Design an enzyme around this catalytic site. Structure first.
Site, PDB file in Angstrom:
ATOM      1  N   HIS B  46      76.221  17.052  -2.010  1.00  0.00           N
ATOM      2  CA  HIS B  46      75.794  18.385  -2.437  1.00  0.00           C
ATOM      3  C   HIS B  46      76.641  18.936  -3.584  1.00  0.00           C
ATOM      4  O   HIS B  46      76.200  19.818  -4.310  1.00  0.00           O
ATOM      5  CB  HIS B  46      75.726  19.376  -1.266  1.00  0.00           C
ATOM      6  CG  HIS B  46      77.028  20.020  -0.914  1.00  0.00           C
ATOM      7  ND1 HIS B  46      77.767  19.638   0.186  1.00  0.00           N
ATOM      8  CD2 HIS B  46      77.705  21.042  -1.485  1.00  0.00           C
ATOM      9  CE1 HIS B  46      78.845  20.393   0.274  1.00  0.00           C
ATOM     10  NE2 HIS B  46      78.837  21.248  -0.734  1.00  0.00           N
ATOM     11  N   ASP B  97      75.102  13.981   3.677  1.00  0.00           N
ATOM     12  CA  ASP B  97      75.925  14.613   2.643  1.00  0.00           C
ATOM     13  C   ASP B  97      77.138  13.728   2.355  1.00  0.00           C
ATOM     14  O   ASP B  97      78.254  13.978   2.835  1.00  0.00           O
ATOM     15  CB  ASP B  97      76.324  16.007   3.093  1.00  0.00           C
ATOM     16  CG  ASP B  97      76.803  16.893   1.953  1.00  0.00           C
ATOM     17  OD1 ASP B  97      76.663  16.517   0.770  1.00  0.00           O
ATOM     18  OD2 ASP B  97      77.332  17.985   2.247  1.00  0.00           O
ATOM     19  N   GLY B 196      84.837  25.319  -1.663  1.00  0.00           N
ATOM     20  CA  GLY B 196      85.738  24.577  -2.545  1.00  0.00           C
ATOM     21  C   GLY B 196      86.455  23.420  -1.842  1.00  0.00           C
ATOM     22  O   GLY B 196      87.073  22.592  -2.499  1.00  0.00           O
ATOM     23  N   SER B 198      84.684  21.255  -0.008  1.00  0.00           N
ATOM     24  CA  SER B 198      83.730  20.180   0.135  1.00  0.00           C
ATOM     25  C   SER B 198      84.109  18.867  -0.524  1.00  0.00           C
ATOM     26  O   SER B 198      84.709  18.818  -1.607  1.00  0.00           O
ATOM     27  CB  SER B 198      82.359  20.576  -0.375  1.00  0.00           C
ATOM     28  OG  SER B 198      81.643  21.094   0.712  1.00  0.00           O
TER      29      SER B 198
END
Lengths: 4, 247
Positions: B46, B97, B196, B198
């Site tokens: 993502h 993801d 932030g 991720s």
């Protein structure tokens, strides 16, 4: 938004 | 990262800092990742889905600060940006993801281990730690969900793995969490991943070595009661990783  | 403590790259030497070049030349932080072999960084799809051109991205290893240089850091281009073809987002969930970045220096080299740079082990197929196990997460994400700046120094914290039974309760996340995800949180809900973080690693001890158990993905708020961090469950993605890391 759930997105990190 | 909400709560926790400041650290340096030496304590999380597989941490990769990923930035994007902006048309007109500003460069800003995108996401974290983890070095799983010399030429390969693992992160979250993502992070990149809006801008899938590999050319715009820069990856740093050995970097302890967000917007200034660390001694021993190394800069890489992205040779291959591999997003998961079955990535999707539902109301909360982000499915599949997971992303891979093949890195190389302008000189054509891949990463070389040092005091500040090391690979992290992958777990064996379907091998996770027991629920209730303490793991660590790391990143440059917000220190408070309401902040507008990111911290300038790398942070990390400890969270505990939550059972799927617990995470799927309706007052947590319900069916939004699948078996291809792991939940983790502080038992008193005082520390957590946040915007932030991720793509960053969830690291647990497994068979006597630090192992990449999850990838920071999503969650409702940061450090809110009954709303844990959700992570892509790495041990369920080995064939995808192996296939996309072959020649």
């Amino acid at each position: 938004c759930s997105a990190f | 990262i909400i709560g926790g403590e400041f650290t340096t790259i030496e304590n999380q030497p597989w941490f990769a800092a990923i930035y994007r070049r902006h048309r007109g030349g500003s460069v800003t932080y995108v996401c974290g990742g983890s070095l799983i072999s010399p030429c390969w960084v693992i992160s979250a799809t993502h992070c990149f889905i809006d801008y899938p051109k590999k050319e715009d991205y820069i990856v740093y290893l050995g970097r302890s600060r967000l917007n200034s240089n660390t001694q021993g850091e190394m800069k890489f281009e992205v040779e291959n940006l591999i997003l998961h073809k079955d990535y999707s987002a539902d109301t909360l969930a982000h499915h599949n993801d997971i992303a891979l970045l093949k890195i190389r220096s302008k000189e054509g080299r891949c990463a070389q281990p040092s005091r500040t740079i090391q690979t992290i082990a992958l777990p064996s197929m379907y091998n996770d730690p027991q629920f209730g196990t303490s793991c660590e997460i790391t990143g440059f994400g917000k220190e408070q969900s309401t902040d507008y700046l990111y911290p300038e120094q790398l942070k990390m914290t400890v969270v505990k793995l939550i059972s799927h039974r617990e995470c799927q309760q309706p007052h947590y996340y319900g069916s939004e969490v699948t078996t291809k995800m792991l939940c983790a949180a502080d038992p008193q809900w005082k520390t957590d991943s946040c915007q932030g973080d991720s793509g960053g690693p969830l690291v647990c001890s497994l068979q006597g070595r630090m192992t990449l158990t999850g990838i920071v993905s999503w969650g409702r708020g940061c450090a809110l009661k009954d709303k844990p961090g959700v992570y892509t469950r790495v041990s369920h993605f080995l064939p995808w990783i192996r296939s996309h890391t072959k020649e």
